[PDB]
Design an enzyme around this catalytic site. Structure first.
Site, PDB file in Angstrom:
ATOM      1  N   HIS A  75      -1.699   6.163   2.069  1.00  0.00           N
ATOM      2  CA  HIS A  75      -0.283   6.300   2.394  1.00  0.00           C
ATOM      3  C   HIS A  75       0.385   7.159   1.328  1.00  0.00           C
ATOM      4  CE1 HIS A  75       0.446   3.187  -0.648  1.00  0.00           C
ATOM      5  NE2 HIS A  75       1.654   2.852  -0.206  1.00  0.00           N
ATOM      6  N   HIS A  77       2.807   6.714  -0.890  1.00  0.00           N
ATOM      7  CA  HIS A  77       3.277   6.230  -2.214  1.00  0.00           C
ATOM      8  C   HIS A  77       2.334   6.691  -3.329  1.00  0.00           C
ATOM      9  CE1 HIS A  77       5.795   2.763  -0.267  1.00  0.00           C
ATOM     10  NE2 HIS A  77       6.487   3.916  -0.299  1.00  0.00           N
ATOM     11  N   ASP A  79       0.781   5.178  -5.656  1.00  0.00           N
ATOM     12  CA  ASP A  79      -0.396   4.328  -5.974  1.00  0.00           C
ATOM     13  C   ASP A  79      -1.608   4.771  -5.137  1.00  0.00           C
ATOM     14  OD1 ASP A  79       0.914   3.045  -3.771  1.00  0.00           O
ATOM     15  OD2 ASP A  79       0.031   1.080  -4.231  1.00  0.00           O
ATOM     16  N   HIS A 137       3.718  -1.344   6.129  1.00  0.00           N
ATOM     17  CA  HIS A 137       4.175  -1.168   4.737  1.00  0.00           C
ATOM     18  C   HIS A 137       4.942   0.151   4.606  1.00  0.00           C
ATOM     19  CE1 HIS A 137       4.333  -0.758   0.506  1.00  0.00           C
ATOM     20  NE2 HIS A 137       3.474   0.285   0.515  1.00  0.00           N
ATOM     21  N   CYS A 156      -2.134  -0.604   1.323  1.00  0.00           N
ATOM     22  CA  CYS A 156      -0.993  -1.450   1.095  1.00  0.00           C
ATOM     23  C   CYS A 156      -0.459  -2.041   2.391  1.00  0.00           C
ATOM     24  CB  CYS A 156       0.104  -0.786   0.293  1.00  0.00           C
ATOM     25  SG  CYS A 156      -0.504   0.079  -1.163  1.00  0.00           S
ATOM     26  N   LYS A 159      -1.510  -7.379   3.273  1.00  0.00           N
ATOM     27  CA  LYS A 159      -0.586  -8.131   2.461  1.00  0.00           C
ATOM     28  C   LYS A 159      -0.691  -9.605   2.828  1.00  0.00           C
ATOM     29  CE  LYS A 159       1.134  -4.803  -0.091  1.00  0.00           C
ATOM     30  NZ  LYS A 159       2.295  -4.068   0.438  1.00  0.00           N
ATOM     31  N   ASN A 165       7.737  -4.670  -1.397  1.00  0.00           N
ATOM     32  CA  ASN A 165       9.009  -3.992  -1.151  1.00  0.00           C
ATOM     33  C   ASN A 165       9.001  -3.381   0.260  1.00  0.00           C
ATOM     34  OD1 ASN A 165      11.340  -2.134  -1.342  1.00  0.00           O
ATOM     35  ND2 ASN A 165       9.790  -0.613  -1.878  1.00  0.00           N
ATOM     36  N   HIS A 195      -3.445  -4.556  -3.771  1.00  0.00           N
ATOM     37  CA  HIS A 195      -2.815  -5.243  -4.899  1.00  0.00           C
ATOM     38  C   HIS A 195      -3.176  -6.726  -4.961  1.00  0.00           C
ATOM     39  CE1 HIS A 195      -0.450  -1.682  -5.466  1.00  0.00           C
ATOM     40  NE2 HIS A 195       0.111  -1.803  -4.276  1.00  0.00           N
TER      41      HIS A 195
END
Ligand code: ZN
Ligand code: ZN
Length: 221
Positions: A75, A77, A79, A137, A156, A159, A165, A195
């Site tokens: 994705h 982001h 990270d 996400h 991500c 989850k 967020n 994560h």
């Protein structure tokens, strides 16, 4: 002053790389991605946060005789994409979906040099498959499936205990997306979230439950 990049064998031909960032309110957050070995070629499944850790990762594998053939970012982001610019600078092929590349551009980030459309994409035929379950996400989130070892890198999107967020999330779509993903990868032996710890196919069900709860919470003032 910040925990070192980890590289740990997960299964035959599959390593987890873990890089670390401090995230306001969340502490020291691990970010897991993979390195997948196909004969003597290495594929990065997500980059570390930083150029410096991306370089550490690449050097570890190259030192041991592997050729970095490409990265895929799950994705937009940082990270997942933090190392794209460095990889590009070294003429290492970088991949992202068309939609991920759009959102990189919108975010003022360097794009992957290669993009793909559609819902299923083979990065490496019979070895590394990219699947788009729908928005969650983020609008662009994809998962990476390794058919030989039945390993799902969830990024991500997965989850199991909380969504994180929701700033860039599509909470209205996430339950539908999660149901689709759960329906497609019930067979997974290992599911690797960004994560939290590696688990099994049960993380698909837990993610759905979280998405459902999150959509409910979104409808409260
Ligand atoms: Zn993210
Ligand atoms: Zn993340």
């Amino acid at each position: 002053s910040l925990p070192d990049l980890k590289i740990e064998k997960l299964d035959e031909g599959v390593y987890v790389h873990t890089s670390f960032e401090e995230v306001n309110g969340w502490g020291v957050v691990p970010k897991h991605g993979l390195v997948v070995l196909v004969n003597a070629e290495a594929y990065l499944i997500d980059t570390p946060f930083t150029a410096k850790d991306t370089e550490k990762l690449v050097t570890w594998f190259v030192e041991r005789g592997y050729k970095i053939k490409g990265s895929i970012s799950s994705h937009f982001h940082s990270d997942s994409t933090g190392g794209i610019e460095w990889l590009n600078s070294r003429s290492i092929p970088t991949y992202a979906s068309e939609l991920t590349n759009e959102l990189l551009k919108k975010d003022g980030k360097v794009q992957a040099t290669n993009s793909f459309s559609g819902v299923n994409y083979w990065l490496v035929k019979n070895k590394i498959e990219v699947f788009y379950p729908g928005p969650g996400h983020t609008p662009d989130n994809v998962v990476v499936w390794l058919p030989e070892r039945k390993i799902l890198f969830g990024g991500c999107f997965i989850k199991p205990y909380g969504l994180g967020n929701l700033g860039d999330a599509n909470i209205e779509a996430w339950p539908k997306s999660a149901k689709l993903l759960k329906s497609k990868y019930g067979k997974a032996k290992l599911v690797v979230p960004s994560h939290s710890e590696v688990g099994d196919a049960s993380l698909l069900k837990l993610t759905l439950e979280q998405a459902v709860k999150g959509l409910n919470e979104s409808k409260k003032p």
